[PDB]
Ligand SMILES: CC1(C)S[C@@H]2[C@H](NC(=O)Cc3ccccc3)C(=O)N2[C@H]1C(=O)O
C-alpha cells in the first residue's frame with residue numbers, strides 16, 4: 001500500500017528506505033536520520049538559524065547574530081511556498097519522519113533520548129520544512145557558496161597605491177591578485193574549450 | 208576537495224571509474240550520512256553531508272555523481288549611497304528607496320537577550336556601514352532566490368539516466384559547485400555549475416561596485432557559458448579546487464589563486480604515470496596524494512640551481528641533497544609520531560624565510576601578514592581541512608619562474624638582488640633554525656608528523672557532540688572527509704556497477720542515556736585510517752543479503 005515504509009539497515013548500520021510515494025520515501029529518510037544523528041542535526045539546525053546561544057550561552061551570541069545577518073529567512077519561506085505539491089512532499093515528508101521519532105524520544109526519554117541532550121540540558125523539538133531546507137541553505141549556500149573579500153581587496157589596493165603610486169599600485173594588485181593566470185592547470189583542457197569572456201582588471205567601475 | 212573521473216580510454220578492466228574526496232574537515236559524529244532510497248522514482252545509494260534530501264556522493268545503478276567546491280566569483284559587493292538626512296534609505300535609479308529591515312532577538316542561556324536589526328537593499332543584506340562616508344555595503348549573490356531550487360536540483364539529479372537528463376538538473380543548481388558524472392557506458396563529464404552574474408562593461412569583479420544603479424548586474428549568464436566537458440580527449444577529469452577552464456576567473460578572495468603552482472598537478476602526475484588505471488590503482492591515488500608534500504615539486508628546482516656550485520661540506524647544499532633524494536611522500540616512523548624524512552620541515556622553514564624576504568616585504572602592513580603563511584600552518588590537533596600551497600607561495604612561484612611566468616612582475620620581489628642570493632640566505636636560516644633544534648646530523652632528525660582529529664564541534668565551531676567524543680588519528684592524510692569510488696562496467700564482475708565508501712567514525716552518533724554507544728558508533732574509524740572501504744549496496748538482493756535489521760512502518764499522511 002501507499003502507507004507502508006520498509007527500512008533495512010546493512011552490516012555497517014546504513015539504512016535503505018523502501019516506499020511507494022514521495023512523502024513516504026522522505027519520511028523514512030527523516031525517521032532514520034532522527035535515530036542516528038538527532039543531536040548532530042539539532043545542533044546543525046541551531047547553527048544554520050543562529051539559535052545556538054539559546055542552549056550554549058554567551059560565547060555564541062556574536063555567532064548567532066552573524067548567522068542571522070547573513071540571510072533573509074522570509075525569502076526562503078517564500079521559495080518553499082512556491083513549490084509544487086510533489087516538491088513540497090520531499091521537505092514535508094522528511095520533517096514529518098523526523099518528528100515521528102522525536103515524539104517517540106520525548107515519550108520515552110529514559111531509554112531513547114541521546115545522552116548529549118542530558119549533558120547540554122535541553123530536549124529536542126519538532127521540525128518543519130523550513131528547518132530541513134535551512135540545513136542545506138545554511139551550509140552549502142550561506143557558507144560554501146558565499147565567499148568574497150572585496151572590501152578587503154579595495155583596502156589592499158588603496159594601500160598599494162599609497163605605497164607605489166596609482167599605476168604601479170594597480171599593477172602590483174594585478175601581480176598579487178591576478179584576475180586570470182594562463183598557466184593555471186585547468187580541469188578542462190584548452191583543446192576542448194576556453195571561457196569566452198574577458199574582464200576589466202583596473203577597477204573601472206569607479207574610473 | 209578532490210575528484211578524479213577516469214573514462215573509457217584511461218580505465219583498465221572497467222569502462223569508467225569515479226573517485227571523490229570532498230574535504231570539509233573531520234568531525235564526530237561523521238560529516239556525511241550513509242543512505243539508500245528506493246521507490247517513488249528513486250533507486251540510489253551513497254552518503255551526503257548533514258543527511259540532505261539529495262545525495263551529493265552516490266550512484267543509481269546507471270550513472271554516478273560527485274562534487275567539489277567551485278570557487279567561482281558569484282558574489283559582488285555594492286556600495287550603497289546613503290544620506291544623513293534620510294536614515295534607512297539609499298539612492299537607486301534616481302530615487303531614495305527604503306531599505307527592508309527586520310528585528311531579531313538572540314535568546315541566551317543564562318544571560319540577557321540581545322536585539323539587533325538586519326538591513327537589506329535590492330543588492331542584498333547589509334554587511335557593514337561607514338557613517339563617515341555615508342556608504343553601506345550590500346552583499347549580492349548570483350544565486351539569491353534559488354537556494355531551494357538548488358537543493359531540489361541535487362535531489363532530482365539522482366533520477367537522471369544520461370548526460371542530458373543530468374545536465375538539465377545541473378542547470379538548476381545555482382551555487383558555485385563543480386559537479387561530475389560517469390555512467391555504465393564509460394562516459395564521463397563535468398560541469399562547473401551555478402548562477403554567475405552578467406556584469407556591466409568595465410566591472411572589475413575583485414572590487415566593490417557603486418549601488419546607485421549604473422553598475423547593477425544585467426542579469427545572469429546563460430547555462431551555455433558554464434564551463435563543462437563531456438568525454439574529454441585526455442580520458443580523465445581531475446580537480447583539487449583548481450580552475451575549471453582556461454580564462455575562467457576564480458573567487459575574488461585575496462588568499463585564493465589559480466596559477467602555475469597548483470596541487471592538482473600531483474593528481475595529473477599519477478593519472479598520467481601509466482596508460483590505464485585499474486580501480487585499485489585509482490583508489491591508491493588517495494593514499495599517495497594524501498601523503499604528498501605539495502611544495503617539493505614547486506621549489507626543488509630553484510633550490511638545486513641555487514646550490515649547484517657549492518662544496519660538499521656546505522650545509523645549504525646538504526639540505527638540498529636531502530630533498531633531492533626524496534619523492535615528497537611522508538611516512539610515519541615506527542614511533543607513530545615523527546616523519547621518516549625531514550623534508551617538509553626543511554621546506555616549511557625555507558619557504559617561511561623566503562616569503563618574509565620577498566612577497567611580505569613588498570606588501571604594506573597589515574596586508575603583509577596575508578602573504579607570510581607557508582601552508583604548513585596547523586594546530587597540535589592538526590589541520591582543520593586540506594593542505595594547500597599558500598597564496599604567498601603561489602606568488603613566489605611566479606617570481607622564481609622569471610620570464611616563464613605570464614604575470615607582469617610590477618614589483619621585483621627580490622628587490623634588485625639575484626634570486627640565488629635570497630634562496631641561499633633562506634637556506635642559511637633554515638640550517639640555523641633546524642640544526643639548533645635537532646643538532647648537526649640530518650640523518651637522525653625526527654621531525655614531528657601532523658595528526659588528524661575528528662572534532663566534536665562542527666565546522667561552524669559549534670558543539671555537535673560532547674568534547675570527549677573527539678577522536679584522534681596519528682597520521683594526518685590530505686584527503687576527503689569521506690572517500691567514495693564507483694566502477695562502471697567492470698570486466699571482473701557481471702554487475703554494471705560496483706561502489707564503495709567510508710563514513711568515519713561510523714554511521715551512528717547515538718549514545719543512550721546510560722552512556723552505551725551504538726553498535727555503529729566507531730566501526731569505520733580503523734577502515735578510514737588504513738585506506739580501507741566498505742561496499743555500498745544498491746539492489747534489493749544485495750541489501751537483503753547484507754541485512755542486519757529491518758523495520759516496517761505503517762503511516763498515513
Ligand atoms: C570557502 C570555504 C568555506 S568552503 C571551501 C572548501 N570546501 C570544500 O571543497 C567542500 C565542498 C565539497 C563539495 C561541495 C561543496 C563544498 C574549503 O575548505 N573551503 C573553505 C575555505 O577556503 O575557507
Ligand SMILES: [Ca+2]
Pocket residue numbers: 148150280281282283284412413414459
Ligand atoms: Ca566578486
